[PDB]
Amino acid sequence: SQKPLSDDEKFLFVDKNFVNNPLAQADWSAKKLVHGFEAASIKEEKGDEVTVELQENGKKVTLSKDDIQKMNPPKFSKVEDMAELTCLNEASVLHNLRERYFSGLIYTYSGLFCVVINPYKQLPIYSEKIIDMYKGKKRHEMPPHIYAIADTAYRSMLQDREDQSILCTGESGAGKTENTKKVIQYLAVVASGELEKQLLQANPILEAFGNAKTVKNDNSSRFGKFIRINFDVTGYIVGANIETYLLEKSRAIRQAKDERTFHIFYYLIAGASEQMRNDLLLEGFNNYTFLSNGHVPIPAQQDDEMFQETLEAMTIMGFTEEEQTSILRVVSSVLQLGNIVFKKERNTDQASMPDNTAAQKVCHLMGINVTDFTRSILTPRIKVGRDVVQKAQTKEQADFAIEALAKAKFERLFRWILTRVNKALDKTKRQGASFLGILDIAGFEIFEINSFEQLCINYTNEKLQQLFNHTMFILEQEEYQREGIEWNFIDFGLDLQPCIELIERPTNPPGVLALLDEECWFPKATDTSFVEKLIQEQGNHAKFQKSKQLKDKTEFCILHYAGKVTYNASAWLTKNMDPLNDNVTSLLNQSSDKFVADLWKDVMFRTVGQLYKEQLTKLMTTLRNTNPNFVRCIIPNHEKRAGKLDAHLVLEQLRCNGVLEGIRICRQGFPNRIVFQEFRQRYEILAANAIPKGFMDGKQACILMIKALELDPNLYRIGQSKIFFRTGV
């Protein structure tokens, strides 16, 4: 794993600066040496306005401290793990990342993170030889790589008897499926199938039903998933089972400017044959309420082919031609549900349907009685016990019930397919003693202004990053326990805890999402009144940022993990809904189309936020029962220019990946931890005096040198094999 001459190590081994010299004067400029940054020397401080000489270009320029950090010694050029820097300044982290990616070093360590930057080309550095190079190797011994992480995980399962999980997250497309595959392939060789070919075909199917287009990514999964790889008690792969959480169901019924709903809706209308369109009651893109918005097409793409492609995959997956069609009957009927609109009655309408042809279209495809359908929607009946109470709803609620159904149907359909994937994937006979839960999920999502969907996403993300902060803390304290380090500090997950409660918190002063729940219960609640509730309750929310005197008429901000984010909330009461009527559910069970009957072969409202809280909890709990391994996905260049890295795009993602914040946690500990004998070697030229680079009393000798150095006791701590040192020390 250490030979550049070989292509399997060419884009792996860190060929860098090997000056090998402990004297700070020899390996660092005598002057105050300072989203790429220019080499500069600090000349004069006028407050934040610090004038520096931009040595890079020879330009004496006044520059705010905002862009001024101490540049680390040249000897740290492209180190394997960013945590190896003397002073953890992200200016040099970014430069190492730029240099490393440019040099072919796609894999980078950063504390606990296995950073993967997309090369936009195939790199040989994942061969079976390379597998063997990491097989049984202790992480740091070899260059950064998922294989090392996979090795760790494997032997943690095998030797330590601990269930593992891969928290792989960031930007979709940046080695999304690759990174997953890297883990699987590592162990395909070590922990040693055919049924995953079907899983590979399932991927694009589930993308049709799970991915959508947005502003910053045109193939983003609108859900989180993980792959449970099952292992034999003796450490062998015997099977796999996948599961999804937090499907952005609202995506099936709405799309914003520059967005597309779930791809399948377009694949079907565009790619269906005329015979299919007739049989499926398909109309054009302007014939639906759903999919309303001019952003239907994608430049240089073709839905026709992708449609067909999906069907080809489905064939491979074992979907019967009729099942395939039935699935598309559902898809179509969802769009036809969009076309259902209620009577304009001036009570909260029981509603009215002068012409329910759209519903007839839906019930044609479903094979259900449109008049039972309509009637029960007009006045939903809720079984209490022996009695059933016809709970009449308004026409607005009836409209929402249709959208609720639409969303529910899409999800059911999705889950059905998902189940079928597992029917193909998850082999029956198998030991499944342990497992590796490979988590595949997007990182923080930030636009110029976010909405509900993003709130839930970022809420999700902070829950998951809490797993990181918590875990990281433990791991740091584990070393403190191994050593004699008493700096307990604080459980860093508590940084997210109030940010999480800000959303999650129910009774007691409600959080933001809980207020949305409140507001979606009172009949005449508005989105303005929601904002007013935020204004009232935010005095108790330290992590909530009330906006400006004029701005607080609608928008407000939240102090998120990935940076402060402005949220809109102009229509959140129309989002946090879902009046799903189970009279329809029953009718669907009673469908003539038996596919549909199977979808709902067995059998309220709540809120969308609440549903995500539940699903999140299930995911988080499952992940917390394992040992988090950390992998992050970065897009260095949106033009896909292999070899180009824009630190702008990257730093943004470092923050959204928790890497930049991970650095802050490291800044709060002891990054530079030096081995007692090492310390004598590192600081001999730096004022040895009585103690050279070797001395009898292991611990005191180093301490004597520390006294000579005159270091501050609050910046270090004497361990058992190391002396812990803070960043910059």
Partner: protein, 375 residues
Amino acid sequence: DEDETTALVCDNGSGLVKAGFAGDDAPRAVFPSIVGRPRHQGVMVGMGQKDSYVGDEAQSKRGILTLKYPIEHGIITNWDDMEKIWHHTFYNELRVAPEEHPTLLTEAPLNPKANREKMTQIMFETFNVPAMYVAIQAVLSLYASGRTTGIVLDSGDGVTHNVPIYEGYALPHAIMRLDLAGRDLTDYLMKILTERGYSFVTTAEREIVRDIKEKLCYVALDFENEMATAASSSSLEKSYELPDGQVITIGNERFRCPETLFQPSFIGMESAGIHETTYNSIMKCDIDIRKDLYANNVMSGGTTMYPGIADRMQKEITALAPSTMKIKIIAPPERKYSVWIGGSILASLSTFQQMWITKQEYDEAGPSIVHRKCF
């Protein structure tokens, strides 16, 4: 559950008792605040193996039981049988632990302190509850209607009230306590059924008359002309088949009793009618306030479940209201359990935690904690 609260809802009354819980959509069980006792007791040919029957039990065995009314107005007559009612509510129907889930009791506007003492003491001594909130009957209906302001009229069999809600809250004089409810229309119905040729001597038969009212009582718009019209003893005359073997036929009398509600002179009294006493309570507010009160005139209760009441009340309100003001009666789709619904709503809201009274607070301040929390 266990560690978490989740409140319970109990909307009692001499009419119907609605059992449920916070966030519930519809009452789990409904039965009158009535407790029956066998005339013979002990060993009987036809009994339910009890010497004390509650709610549906009492109404199922009317033929053998003497019917007592622990709630009479909403006034507690027998607080021991009130425990039986709440036993039936929480233990039998709901089947939940009161030493765990906070509870919510409803209260008729202008309720004597003695009743508050009886209710509070029991809940924190017999059914020991972590916290219990007493909520104003009528006001709960307002919330169920989906409003935070307006006239709040609640008119059933027990007692008719009106609690106008505005910037501030109605005081003991703008709150109506009308002694002219369905109880009086029930007894009047009985009397005019004897005019036809029927007899309802016993308490069980008194209840049968009330049960008859439920499914026939029609609210006329033009009594005189409809009285003549409904003389059709064939096409418009309709009987009530009591599931037991008794059929009571009623003609144009179906809309004779409602007239007593609007005009007690139909009984023989000079008392003001429901819309006149309502008007009287409306005049206790400012001109600006009563305009908004008219705009959202929320009505619920048994007397608002009868056909024709929507148009009749609207006419009557506009008769006693400025023509320059917006006048609209609010008629929810569910006006029978509108009070219970309000309880379910507020109990599910976090604001319940700032309204309830805890057992600790009771134990310290005693019964007086009720008014110490709020009057």
